[PDB]
Design a protein around this ligand. Sequence first.
Ligand SMILES: CCC[C@H](N)C(=O)O
Length: 244
Amino acid sequence: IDPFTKTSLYESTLKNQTDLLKVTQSTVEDFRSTNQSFTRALEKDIANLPYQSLITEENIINNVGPILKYYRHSINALNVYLGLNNGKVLLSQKSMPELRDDLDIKTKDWYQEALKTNDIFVTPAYLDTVLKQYVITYSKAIYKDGKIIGVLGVDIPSEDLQNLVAKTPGNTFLFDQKNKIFAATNKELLNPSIDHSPVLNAYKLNGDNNFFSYKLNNEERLGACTKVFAYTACITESADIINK
Ligand SMILES: CCC[C@H](N)C(=O)O
């Protein structure tokens, strides 16, 4: 009851929840940075091959192929590949890299977006054509002496990020670009019929990392969200810690 005591519980739980929100944010950042560094190392190993190893398709197969496979294995990627300007892609896929001419790579955002930036491009989650699993793709236009060799692509199962986020402490969860629930420690939050407007509206009024209160079934809750890349990470708890 005493306003001194209520304030001290509010400050205390505010510190705990925002600490745990940061753990989930860091989880998403570390996932992306690990994958980007992997993709950069692979780009460098392909680009450092002699030109003779790169200028025929058969040489690409025999000299880039093993590299794609060793990298795929090292990180347990789903697919690792190099897309070429003739529309063919050298593909190293889970369950010997082959040159494929039937995957329409020039229509894929991971291909075309890599050509418009000098950075690694990261897709949202989407259904992989090759193995029919949801993936996040990291892609990168590879250049050697200013000449494009092709577009590197690395597919990581989006389930990997979901499991990483789910294992974090706290009632944390993650929205995707379309404000659709993407990951959650509490699996029940993945129910697609749940209305998330209360917590998203509270976030919209308060801003990144700013603790707020909101209502659920006429009961007070506390929470905070923050943008992480194009995701939105949130945490929420009951307000009983301050009220009881
Ligand atoms: C070989 C390209 C594979 C990529 N996951 C896609 O669906 O385009």
